[PDB]
Design an enzyme around this catalytic site. Sequence first.
Site, PDB file in Angstrom:
ATOM      1  N   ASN A 146       0.797  -1.218   0.000  1.00 21.87           N
ATOM      2  CA  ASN A 146       0.000   0.000   0.000  1.00 21.87           C
ATOM      3  C   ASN A 146       0.830   1.268   0.000  1.00 21.87           C
ATOM      4  OD1 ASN A 146      -2.557   1.628   0.564  1.00 21.87           O
ATOM      5  ND2 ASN A 146      -1.319   2.099   2.374  1.00 21.87           N
ATOM      6  N   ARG A 194      -8.533   5.015   1.260  1.00 21.94           N
ATOM      7  CA  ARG A 194      -7.736   4.437   0.185  1.00 21.94           C
ATOM      8  C   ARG A 194      -6.683   5.376  -0.404  1.00 21.94           C
ATOM      9  NH1 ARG A 194     -12.671   1.937  -0.512  1.00 21.94           N
ATOM     10  NH2 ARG A 194     -12.415  -0.303  -0.067  1.00 21.94           N
ATOM     11  N   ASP A 248       1.688   7.006   0.346  1.00 21.29           N
ATOM     12  CA  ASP A 248       0.661   6.145  -0.210  1.00 21.29           C
ATOM     13  C   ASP A 248       0.873   5.964  -1.706  1.00 21.29           C
ATOM     14  OD1 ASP A 248      -1.779   4.751   0.899  1.00 21.29           O
ATOM     15  OD2 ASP A 248      -2.720   5.826  -0.772  1.00 21.29           O
ATOM     16  N   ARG A 293       0.034 -12.643   2.370  1.00 20.69           N
ATOM     17  CA  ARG A 293      -0.799 -11.732   3.157  1.00 20.69           C
ATOM     18  C   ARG A 293      -0.677 -10.351   2.515  1.00 20.69           C
ATOM     19  NH1 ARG A 293       0.181  -7.631   7.204  1.00 20.69           N
ATOM     20  NH2 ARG A 293      -1.479  -7.640   8.778  1.00 20.69           N
ATOM     21  N   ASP A 326      -0.953  -6.825   3.238  1.00 22.72           N
ATOM     22  CA  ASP A 326      -0.981  -5.884   4.335  1.00 22.72           C
ATOM     23  C   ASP A 326      -1.825  -4.660   3.989  1.00 22.72           C
ATOM     24  OD1 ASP A 326       0.391  -4.825   6.926  1.00 22.72           O
ATOM     25  OD2 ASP A 326       0.783  -3.219   5.453  1.00 22.72           O
ATOM     26  N   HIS A 358      -6.813  -0.250   2.882  1.00 26.98           N
ATOM     27  CA  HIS A 358      -6.296   1.020   2.396  1.00 26.98           C
ATOM     28  C   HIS A 358      -5.997   1.005   0.913  1.00 26.98           C
ATOM     29  CE1 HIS A 358      -6.233   2.636   6.407  1.00 26.98           C
ATOM     30  NE2 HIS A 358      -5.886   1.419   6.788  1.00 26.98           N
ATOM     31  N   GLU A 404      -5.461  -8.465   4.526  1.00 28.77           N
ATOM     32  CA  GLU A 404      -5.693  -7.905   5.860  1.00 28.77           C
ATOM     33  C   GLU A 404      -6.677  -6.776   5.740  1.00 28.77           C
ATOM     34  OE1 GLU A 404      -3.295  -5.015   7.566  1.00 28.77           O
ATOM     35  OE2 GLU A 404      -3.668  -5.630   9.619  1.00 28.77           O
ATOM     36  N   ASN A 461      -3.108 -11.568  16.454  1.00 26.71           N
ATOM     37  CA  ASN A 461      -2.064 -11.337  15.465  1.00 26.71           C
ATOM     38  C   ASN A 461      -0.981 -10.464  16.030  1.00 26.71           C
ATOM     39  OD1 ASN A 461      -2.945  -8.670  15.174  1.00 26.71           O
ATOM     40  ND2 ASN A 461      -3.042  -8.743  12.955  1.00 26.71           N
ATOM     41  N   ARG A 491      -4.663 -19.761  11.275  1.00 22.45           N
ATOM     42  CA  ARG A 491      -3.294 -19.273  11.478  1.00 22.45           C
ATOM     43  C   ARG A 491      -3.010 -19.228  12.981  1.00 22.45           C
ATOM     44  NH1 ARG A 491      -2.238 -13.400   9.523  1.00 22.45           N
ATOM     45  NH2 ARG A 491      -3.359 -12.980  11.475  1.00 22.45           N
TER      46      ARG A 491
HETATM   47  C1  LIG Z   1      -4.751   1.810  15.823  1.00 24.44           C
HETATM   48  C2  LIG Z   1      -3.948   2.446  14.764  1.00 24.44           C
HETATM   49  O1  LIG Z   1      -2.645   1.759  14.714  1.00 24.44           O
HETATM   50  C3  LIG Z   1      -1.755   2.399  13.745  1.00 24.44           C
HETATM   51  O2  LIG Z   1      -2.289   2.271  12.497  1.00 24.44           O
HETATM   52  C4  LIG Z   1      -1.581   1.311  11.680  1.00 24.44           C
HETATM   53  C5  LIG Z   1      -2.368   0.250  11.049  1.00 24.44           C
HETATM   54  C6  LIG Z   1      -3.901   0.141  11.138  1.00 24.44           C
HETATM   55  C7  LIG Z   1      -4.652   0.355  10.013  1.00 24.44           C
HETATM   56  C8  LIG Z   1      -6.050   0.233  10.083  1.00 24.44           C
HETATM   57  O3  LIG Z   1      -6.818   0.452   8.979  1.00 24.44           O
HETATM   58  C9  LIG Z   1      -6.658  -0.126  11.304  1.00 24.44           C
HETATM   59  O4  LIG Z   1      -8.075  -0.264  11.394  1.00 24.44           O
HETATM   60  C10 LIG Z   1      -5.870  -0.363  12.416  1.00 24.44           C
HETATM   61  O5  LIG Z   1      -6.483  -0.734  13.635  1.00 24.44           O
HETATM   62  C11 LIG Z   1      -4.492  -0.240  12.367  1.00 24.44           C
HETATM   63  O6  LIG Z   1      -1.927  -0.463   9.886  1.00 24.44           O
HETATM   64  C12 LIG Z   1      -0.489  -0.255   9.528  1.00 24.44           C
HETATM   65  C13 LIG Z   1      -0.016  -1.057   8.480  1.00 24.44           C
HETATM   66  C14 LIG Z   1       1.328  -0.908   8.085  1.00 24.44           C
HETATM   67  O7  LIG Z   1       1.804  -1.685   7.052  1.00 24.44           O
HETATM   68  C15 LIG Z   1       2.197   0.025   8.740  1.00 24.44           C
HETATM   69  C16 LIG Z   1       1.683   0.797   9.790  1.00 24.44           C
HETATM   70  O8  LIG Z   1       2.556   1.751  10.460  1.00 24.44           O
HETATM   71  C17 LIG Z   1       0.326   0.677  10.205  1.00 24.44           C
HETATM   72  C18 LIG Z   1      -0.214   1.501  11.294  1.00 24.44           C
HETATM   73  O9  LIG Z   1       0.500   2.354  11.862  1.00 24.44           O
HETATM   74  C19 LIG Z   1      -1.622   3.894  13.940  1.00 24.44           C
HETATM   75  O10 LIG Z   1      -1.004   4.211  15.213  1.00 24.44           O
HETATM   76  C20 LIG Z   1       0.353   4.590  15.116  1.00 24.44           C
HETATM   77  O11 LIG Z   1       1.134   3.347  15.297  1.00 24.44           O
HETATM   78  C21 LIG Z   1       2.579   3.617  15.304  1.00 24.44           C
HETATM   79  C22 LIG Z   1       3.360   2.354  15.454  1.00 24.44           C
HETATM   80  O12 LIG Z   1       3.089   1.500  14.270  1.00 24.44           O
HETATM   81  C23 LIG Z   1       2.073   0.517  14.527  1.00 24.44           C
HETATM   82  O13 LIG Z   1       1.413   0.460  15.550  1.00 24.44           O
HETATM   83  C24 LIG Z   1       1.863  -0.466  13.355  1.00 24.44           C
HETATM   84  C25 LIG Z   1       0.755  -1.279  13.405  1.00 24.44           C
HETATM   85  C26 LIG Z   1       0.491  -2.288  12.267  1.00 24.44           C
HETATM   86  C27 LIG Z   1       1.494  -2.721  11.432  1.00 24.44           C
HETATM   87  C28 LIG Z   1       1.152  -3.642  10.432  1.00 24.44           C
HETATM   88  C29 LIG Z   1      -0.172  -4.061  10.333  1.00 24.44           C
HETATM   89  O14 LIG Z   1      -0.567  -4.971   9.327  1.00 24.44           O
HETATM   90  C30 LIG Z   1      -1.140  -3.604  11.168  1.00 24.44           C
HETATM   91  O15 LIG Z   1      -2.460  -4.045  11.041  1.00 24.44           O
HETATM   92  C31 LIG Z   1      -0.808  -2.688  12.176  1.00 24.44           C
HETATM   93  C32 LIG Z   1       2.894   4.534  16.472  1.00 24.44           C
HETATM   94  O16 LIG Z   1       4.292   4.819  16.453  1.00 24.44           O
HETATM   95  C33 LIG Z   1       2.141   5.813  16.386  1.00 24.44           C
HETATM   96  O17 LIG Z   1       2.358   6.527  17.605  1.00 24.44           O
HETATM   97  C34 LIG Z   1       0.668   5.623  16.172  1.00 24.44           C
HETATM   98  O18 LIG Z   1       0.069   6.863  15.725  1.00 24.44           O
HETATM   99  C35 LIG Z   1      -2.931   4.557  13.985  1.00 24.44           C
HETATM  100  O19 LIG Z   1      -2.720   5.950  14.339  1.00 24.44           O
HETATM  101  C36 LIG Z   1      -3.774   3.937  15.017  1.00 24.44           C
HETATM  102  O20 LIG Z   1      -5.064   4.592  15.005  1.00 24.44           O
HETATM  103 CA   LIG Z   2      -3.728   3.585  -0.197  1.00 27.06          CA
HETATM  104 CL   LIG Z   3      -3.190 -10.247   9.929  1.00 22.33          CL
END
Ligand SMILES: C[C@@H]1O[C@@H](Oc2c(-c3cc(O)c(O)c(O)c3)oc3cc(O)cc(O)c3c2=O)[C@H](O[C@@H]2O[C@H](COC(=O)/C=C/c3ccc(O)c(O)c3)[C@@H](O)[C@H](O)[C@H]2O)[C@H](O)[C@H]1O
Ligand SMILES: [Ca+2]
Ligand SMILES: [Cl-]
Length: 496
Positions: free
Chosen positions: A100, A158, A167, A195, A197, A201, A233, A298, A337
């Site tokens: 993405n 998206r 993006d 998967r 990811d 989005h 995902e 997960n 899984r």
């Molecule tokens: C609950 C949500 O978690 C985080 O959103 C992410 C999420 C996410 C996306 C969504 O659509 C959703 O519904 C959700 O609950 C989480 O997906 C990601 C995918 C990636 O490939 C890389 C990423 O960095 C993210 C990601 O950041 C975001 O939070 C940020 O996470 C950052 C750390 O990175 C993560 O927590 C990564 C989570 C992640 C990584 C991979 C995934 O496949 C996934 O589902 C989740 C922190 O440093 C920041 O302080 C914080 O703002 C977002 O603001 C928050 O609302």
């Molecule tokens: Ca996108």
């Molecule tokens: Cl997953």
Amino acid sequence: QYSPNTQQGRTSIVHLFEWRWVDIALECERYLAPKGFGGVQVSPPNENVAIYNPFRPWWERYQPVSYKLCTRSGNEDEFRNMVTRCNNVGVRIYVDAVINHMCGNAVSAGTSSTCGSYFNPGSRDFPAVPYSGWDFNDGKCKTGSGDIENYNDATQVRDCRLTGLLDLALEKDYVRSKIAEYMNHLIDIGVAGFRLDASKHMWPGDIKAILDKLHNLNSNWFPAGSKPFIYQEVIDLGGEPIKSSDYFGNGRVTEFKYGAKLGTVIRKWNGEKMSYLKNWGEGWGFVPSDRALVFVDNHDNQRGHGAGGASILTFWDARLYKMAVGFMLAHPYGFTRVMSSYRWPRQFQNGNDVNDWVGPPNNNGVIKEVTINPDTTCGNDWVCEHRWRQIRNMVIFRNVVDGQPFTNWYDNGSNQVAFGRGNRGFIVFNNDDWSFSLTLQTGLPAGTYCDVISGDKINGNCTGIKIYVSDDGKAHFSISNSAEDPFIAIHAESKL
Ligand SMILES: C[C@@H]1O[C@@H](Oc2c(-c3cc(O)c(O)c(O)c3)oc3cc(O)cc(O)c3c2=O)[C@H](O[C@@H]2O[C@H](COC(=O)/C=C/c3ccc(O)c(O)c3)[C@@H](O)[C@H](O)[C@H]2O)[C@H](O)[C@H]1O
Ligand SMILES: [Ca+2]
Ligand SMILES: [Cl-]
């Protein structure tokens, strides 16, 4: 895209989260193959940003710099070695495909990357791909900030930046082609699927256009015309405009409702009880079974900030976790899984774990090997849930009962339940505050069966509990509410 392409008789994958390729390769040979595991979900194998504040977080791997197969898990040689060695013992590899986005828009330019490739997020320059400003959605996104602000607007979800991650312009044939080039590199190496990811989005039709460009699976290991297994995902707990069903054309979807609800039930929160699990599956509002990738936790939600919030069960809640995983593995709904984790020093402050960023066990950023202890557990702070007897034996249960119908359900109207899978397996749970002691119809042939939760069948011996099934299929089960593992499972291959 819907078939996992596992070897016949193997019915689960395990997420070996942040494992090195050489350790996965050894694990395929010494454990996954003989214990009947179908395959492994690996962490993203493409080059990512080396993030040093905080120090090498797990989530750095979700910020790509290029598609070079060069990460803290290993280099391309090591990746190829792993896929080959795993396929050669009938254990598949599924890649976590981060397509993405590239990295955070505020990350500093330079060569702070796992293969040393240069990148400049500010100028949108990723020359190791190559991508430029023309390849991102800056112009298409309509929010003031350029980031996703409102999940009620399916367009910005998206087209705008997920928490500032650049993006990709996935409508462009150039970008679709670079992603397909990466994915075809992996397919030809021998990966069985992906998967996808952050699929919520991406537009379903952009994902389609990328999948359209993919090779058939490697014909040394897979029959001709085999297609990669695709699981997207999509975090859809209901209520949002985006529905995971919009993605069914492309493959399966992660069913995040599964672990959220099961966790609530096993915790006996919100008035939930195991007896309600009688109609588990679509009856609970889940996607069709044939489109579900299911799991208890997960890598994201086991940290508590995830889809399902506080109800999610993890290895930290080991006793209840085994029960939830056991129920999932016995029940026919979905493709299963299993998670395999590392420990990190949790530190809660007002419910939030301030160390939830911590990456895998490491020596100054170099990931530690997975060591195997004499009892078959892992050292170096790898949890190795997939090696816990109660979980590994339920992975085998699922293989043994594959295709058999959910039948012979029992419940006490509270939290004592049992059910069978045709004439091949039977499982019994006690999650009430009093003992279970009852003779139940098991559906199984008469004989003496090893309980595969408390022990193992070894030759003609059981190392744990024995269950005695009479000529009429009935057997007595005794489970104290204080039991270490308050469930019992028996199957055709645990019969003496
Ligand atoms: C609950 C949500 O978690 C985080 O959103 C992410 C999420 C996410 C996306 C969504 O659509 C959703 O519904 C959700 O609950 C989480 O997906 C990601 C995918 C990636 O490939 C890389 C990423 O960095 C993210 C990601 O950041 C975001 O939070 C940020 O996470 C950052 C750390 O990175 C993560 O927590 C990564 C989570 C992640 C990584 C991979 C995934 O496949 C996934 O589902 C989740 C922190 O440093 C920041 O302080 C914080 O703002 C977002 O603001 C928050 O609302
Ligand atoms: Ca996108
Ligand atoms: Cl997953």
